[PDB]
Amino acid sequence: AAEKKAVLFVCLGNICRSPACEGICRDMVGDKLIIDSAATSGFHVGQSPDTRSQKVCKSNGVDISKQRARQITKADFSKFDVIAALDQSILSDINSMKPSNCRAKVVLFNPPNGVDDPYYSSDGFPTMFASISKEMKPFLTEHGLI
């Protein structure tokens, strides 16, 4: 009974480590679900040069397309099956709004140290993907897939 779900990969705008989950996963399995980038802070949108992250991604192993970060509504809970929050702020906030009856779960992704691409040096493209996948085998495989 192996099925596919959908984890909400969020971080802080759907740009840092967010647009990397779709590629890391797309290549990890080939083409399924469990990949849902999101963000609870419509601050950095319609901007942010994601050519560096997307570049290293295709140079390390990541197939994406566009990262139009957008505000997260309330369907994120009934629009998928799992919610992955990179930084703790995402898990803490998203939990401060979650209702009291739903069918989705909220899990944290790596500690507040791995995925931390700031926005000045290329010290995230490598680390971001590193954790993006280094935490996708011990997670997706144990989140209800493989």
Specify burial of residue 46 (Cβ count, 10 A radius: 0-12, 13-18, 19+). Answer: exposed
* Cβ(35)–Cβ(8) below 8 Å: no
From the CB of residue 33, how many other CB atoms can be counted at a distance below 10 Å?
A: 16
**Residue 63 falls in which region: left (phi positive, over 0), alpha (psi -120 to 50) or beta:** beta
Closest by CA to 18, choosing from 120, 75, 41, 60, is 41
Closest by CA to 27, choosing from 136, 127, 115, is 136
- β partners of residue 10: 38, 85
Determination technique for this entry: NMR
Beta-strand ranges (E) seen in the chain are 7-10, 36-38, 82-85, 105-108
Catalytic residues: 11, 17, 117
* Cβ(35)–Cβ(18) below 8 Å: no
In angstroms, the CA 64 to CA 47 distance is 17
In angstroms, the CA 41 to CA 28 distance is 28
Per CATH, the architecture of 1-146 is what?
A: 3-Layer(aba) Sandwich (3.40)
* Cβ(20)–Cβ(56) below 8 Å: no
